[PDB]
């Protein structure tokens, strides 16, 4: 659904068509003007950062594994005559429709008997999904993956690509897959009895030399070398695929460009009348196009074990019954062609729709992981109460759409209760300790991180014990639309730390809430604060991120009693464009204000600019008003004359309109 | 945009068609009559300057470099039916448009897929840019650049063309470039898949033997030997260029006249309907064509670092799909063929439009440089507040047209937000003193200029320091259209200043404004006064520039606060009218009137006379046969002007919204 | 003062120069001005009573 994913984008964000991606890492964000203030009994110290960049790093790598599951049939496409008043295939009108058609008379009785089983095999989501992946593999084919590269680095702990993804050879995305071609046979119209467990599709005119090569590779096993997101492992959809094309199927060309895959999709959707099938495939790919680079070192627990992708079995019986598909189809919603029409016009817009969906999910799974099991709406039972339909199993797209509904605070409506795609809530529901590997840089690591060893020499491979999952992404596109006090993503905020002159700089935060806001605002001001817990004896640093520049309470890496000693004569100025706290006395009052917002994207430590035309909000009415218009100007070549007009020179001629 | 740049010229001046330029340097100015009237405590004196020549100097020498960048598509020339009710390109109607205009309907699905990807990147501005440069290389192909010539010469200091332009030799303009030829192949109709990264263009009848050689050289690399404005380094546009000509193309001749390049441009525009693409290239050349000769030695800091010329990527899909270009083209403005109709009639008029543009930019940057970096409108954030469109980036022409709006004080509007051309604000946007290399002519040079070596000898090559960039040009064409206090370019003005007490033979001027008014009066009377800056200990002189007969405060060459000790005993008498007095007494009143303006141009120390007939006006009205003004003010670029609000400091300038 | 000036301020007026130098001494700051015309020096700390 293009419509619901479009509304997630911010108001200030004005996207263009083309986006020239030339790397496997993008820092999307915005530039804002922060007017910071520090008030005290001595006086006020004002600062101003005119261009403050708040970013979330997003990569094109992520371990996924496809499995073939059984899903509901999508009945949108078949002629409206055979359907009854309630909206199910009234068998008896099917036998009537087949009888009054251009079918062979000896096949009518035997084909009608099979109809009861074969007409309820309508799900082309798996085919469209694979064909969409082939489009983006050939478009962004020049992106590279190095084996000994930095997945994450925060100064203390480092995590390499070798650690998370073993059995991984370095190669380009184009050179990753070597897809073998499945057989594309021609359906004989005079076949005695239809062959079930072999799908048959429709086609307009002649199957081109390149269309054979695309359909051949789409219905085949994906066995990748490099762990890419749009080239993950998928099982063999089918062995053989029939195509009811009276004009013969040309043999396989071997080569094809990304423009030829768009040609193949547009013919397949139009012939089969499968637009709702495409809408399902569009939302599936939106989840599993890009995966987020973790915000903290201990936020890598989400991507340790491979999340399963639920691909519904390829099943289509249109080739055997050409009569039942015509120009008057049955559809539930009137805006059922909107998702395809959006993709054909603006293919590269999927990148923005993808980051919008994963940012919405991973933000909400952040503040869902911090609720006790003894509650009404908890970790296990947040999907059941929200869903008001009848899906087969609460997995895939249902779990991701219900998290988006919680974030935006609106009602998401789909025409069919389809349960296909990636399932994210895997590591959460387990409710056990996860052992993430790490290579150390400094020697004073295991004070900060909950490490397995207490003394570790530099360059050693250690393990961190993560119990509660910290947030993987900070809200950026969904900044101050549905604000919570955990993230504290306000435009205006203030904190009041109360100290007396008798205290020699040392302040104890009994409250946990205002400790989080103090440590966060001090980092905007470019000050390196290092607090020490009095009960346990561990240490926390506000500088625990190089992207967002905020301090969340989950950076403590421990749930206990709150007694944080902060010594305010060991505060060090780290960044540029900073206010100085030289020597405070009395009550401190910190405050900031974010005024304006400008969309910015970075890649390879350089600005990535959006190019091409101005993207519009395509509606169903905007095309069918031109159908209402029809260009009703009678196609008659009316040539109008020009009267020559003489003036002073007479050498040169001058023509007038009348 | 002819009508825009034509408005910048003064109301009294109307230039003739032809101009035989026969040098690399042209003075332009006017011969005005000044009627001064003096009054002080001693008495009254009345005089009259009968003939006074105020002029700038402009040259054909400027170091520039080309970069190929991706910009917006210009959707002008495509048929009106493919566009919907709003100003948006619908792919639903492209499928219909291509379907109705063919008998072979097998190719419609393939044609639509490729067309959707190519239409959002169509731009012929870079091709017309090179074709225009080839026209002027052949026409003015007898201009000599000598390496051991003078660039600036005052009397104390001197800059040679060895400095500012190393890696250069002595050559004529025709001898500078030795262009190779790109392959101009013929597109046979029947080819089904458009070859990627090769543009295809339409043509009228047979491609002439001469037309081949021009298109071949226009696409090739430019590698100059001598630094020339219209022969600057440009990267290779394309390798191949298809031409859908019904009659086959002829082989390349090798030689062509400047008249043959006009025939090539006129055909290429008419066939492709690329009138708005030409308008972009016309404005883009108006910036580059000429460069200023600096007013003082400090104003050479602008032209040290090579400014980047943003040339858009060459792409076009008219040759493949000639159905999309028909007899009813889509245009936003009704005056969309005025710029080409102006150039084809009067080619040599571009010289006057270029001088008018570069003057307006370099005059207003004189004020922007003096703005403090702690206000709403400053050097960093003046373009962003002005623009009211959605370009790719605030670069090239958008920066230049913003400065023209600030000069004239009128709202400038283009149909498409194009960001292509020279960016000047590079030396300005950096907090670093610039090291201008100079030659010592007189032994007393270190007293005047801020030199590194305080002791020098006639012939030594030293370096001078420039912190704040002074004005490179004085207002001549834009004289009195809007008068600032800094320049003081009034027709009628009454200057009042109080003379400081002359103790021994020295008068102390503590205030900054009073000192500016005093030396401004004494210059108009014609008295060469020399003062000593007390803080620095360097001698200032009101006779700094001889060409423009006025005193600017930037001739002091010291940003900050100071007090001046004026030498009243050594007041020389260079130019004496009857008004001219040596001994001022009490409150000095000078009231002057300027009348009888007449434009005059000098080239190689002789008068340069305009030849040919009188320019008759070509211009189209807002409506041809259009009923309702469908505003469509969403995509169109608009540039809002800023008015200078004078304040007490006088050294600092400030902008406000009118 | 403007940021373009690197701390250096010239007092054209005599009245406000006296008030600046006096209030800076209440605040306990040793200021040393230099006259541009003559070339002599003045110090605000020229008394230990008032």
Curated annotation (Swiss-Prot), chains A, B:
It comes from the Viruses. GO terms for biological process: viral translational frameshifting. This is Major capsid protein. Its main location: virion. The keyword RNA-binding applies. Belongs to the totivirus major capsid protein family. Capsid protein self-assembles to form an icosahedral capsid with a T=2 symmetry, about 40 nm in diameter, and consisting of 60 capsid proteins asymmetric dimers. The capsid encapsulates the genomic dsRNA and the polymerase and remains intact following cell entry to protect the dsRNA from degradation and to prevent unfavorable antiviral responses in the host cell during all the replication cycle of the virus. Nascent transcripts are transcribed within the structural confines of the virion and are extruded into the cytoplasm. One of its GO terms (molecular function) is RNA binding. It is found in: Virion. GO terms for cellular component: viral capsid. The keyword RNA-binding applies. InterPro entries: Major_coat_LA-virus (IPR015302), Major_coat_LA-virus_sf (IPR036332). Keywords: Capsid protein, RNA-binding, Virion.
């Amino acid at each position: 659904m293009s419509s619901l994913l479009n509304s997630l984008l911010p108001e200030y964000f004005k996207p263009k068509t083309n986006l020239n991606i030339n790397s496997s890492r993008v820092q999307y964000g915005f530039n804002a003007r922060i007017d910071m203030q520090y008030e005290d009994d001595s006086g006020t110290r004002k600062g101003s950062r005119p261009n403050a960049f708040m970013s979330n790093t997003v990569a094109f790598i992520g371990n996924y594994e496809g499995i073939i599951v059984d899903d509901i049939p999508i009945l949108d496409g078949l002629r409206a005559d055979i359907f009854d008043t309630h909206g199910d295939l009234d068998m008896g009108l099917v036998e009537d429709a087949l009888s009054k058609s251009t079918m062979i008379r000896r096949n009518v009785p035997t084909y009608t008997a099979y109809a009861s089983e074969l007409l309820y095999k309508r799900n082309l989501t798996s085919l469209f999904y694979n064909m969409l992946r082939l489009y983006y593999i050939k478009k962004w084919g020049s992106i590279k993956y190095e084996k000994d590269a930095i997945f994450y680095d925060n100064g203390h702990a480092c995590l390499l690509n070798r650690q998370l993804f073993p059995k991984s050879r370095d190669a380009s995305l184009e050179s990753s897959l070597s897809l073998p071609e499945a057989e594309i046979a021609m359906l004989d119209p005079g076949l005695e009895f239809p062959e079930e467990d072999v799908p048959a599709i429709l086609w307009h005119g002649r199957v081109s030399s390149r269309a054979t090569c695309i359909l051949g590779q789409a219905c085949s096993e994906f066995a990748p070398l490099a762990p890419f997101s749009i080239a993950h492992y998928s099982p063999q959809l089918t062995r053989k695929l029939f195509v009811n094309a009276p004009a013969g199927i040309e043999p396989s060309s071997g080569r094809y460009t990304h423009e030829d895959v768009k040609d193949a999709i547009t013919i397949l959707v139009s012939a089969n009348q499968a637009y709702t099938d495409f809408e399902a495939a569009y939302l599936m790919l939106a989840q599993t196009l890009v995966s987020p680079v973790p915000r903290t070192a201990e936020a890598s627990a989400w991507f340790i074990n491979a999340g399963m992708v639920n691909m519904p079995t390829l099943s289509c019986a249109n080739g055997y019954y050409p009569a039942l598909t015509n120009v008057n189809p049955y559809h539930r919603l009137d805006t059922w062609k909107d998702t395809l029409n959006h993709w054909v016009a603006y293919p590269d817009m999927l990148f923005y729709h993808s980051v919008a969906m994963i940012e919405s999910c991973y933000v909400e799974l952040g503040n869902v992981a911090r609720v006790s099991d003894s509650d009404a709406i908890n970790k296990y039972t947040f999907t059941e109460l929200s869903v008001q339909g009848r899906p087969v199993m609460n997995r895939g797209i249902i779990v991701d759409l219900t998290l988006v509904a919680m974030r935006t605070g609106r009602e998401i409506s789909l025409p069919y209760p389809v349960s296909c795609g990636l399932t994210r809530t895997d590591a959460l529901l387990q409710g056990t300790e996860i052992h993430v590997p790490v290579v150390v840089k400094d020697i004073d690591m295991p004070q900060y991180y909950n490490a397995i060893d207490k003394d570790v020499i530099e360059g050693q491979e250690t393990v961190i014990k993560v119990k509660q999952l910290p947030p993987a992404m900070y809200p950026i596109y969904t900044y101050g639309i549905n604000t919570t006090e955990f993230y504290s993503d306000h435009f205006e905020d203030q904190v009041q730390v109360e100290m007396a002159p008798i205290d020699n700089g040392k302040a104890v935060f009994n409250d946990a809430r205002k400790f989080s806001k103090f440590m966060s605002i001090m980092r905007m001001m470019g000050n390196d604060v290092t607090a020490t817990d009095l009960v346990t004896g561990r240490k926390v640093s506000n500088w625990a991120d190089n992207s967002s520049g905020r301090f969340l309470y989950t950076d403590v890496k421990y749930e206990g009693q709150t007694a944080f000693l902060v010594d305010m004569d060991t505060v060090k100025a780290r960044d540029h464009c900073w206010v100085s706290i030289v020597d405070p006395n009395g009550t401190m009052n910190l405050s900031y204000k974010m005024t304006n917002f400008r969309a910015a994207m970075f890649s390879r430590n350089k600005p990535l600019y959006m190019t091409g035309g101005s993207v519009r909000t395509i509606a169903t009415g905007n095309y069918r008003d031109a159908a209402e218009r029809l260009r009703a100007m009678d196609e008659t070549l009316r040539l109008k004359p020009f009267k020559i007009t003489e003036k002073l020179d007479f050498r040169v001629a001058a023509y007038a309109i009348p």
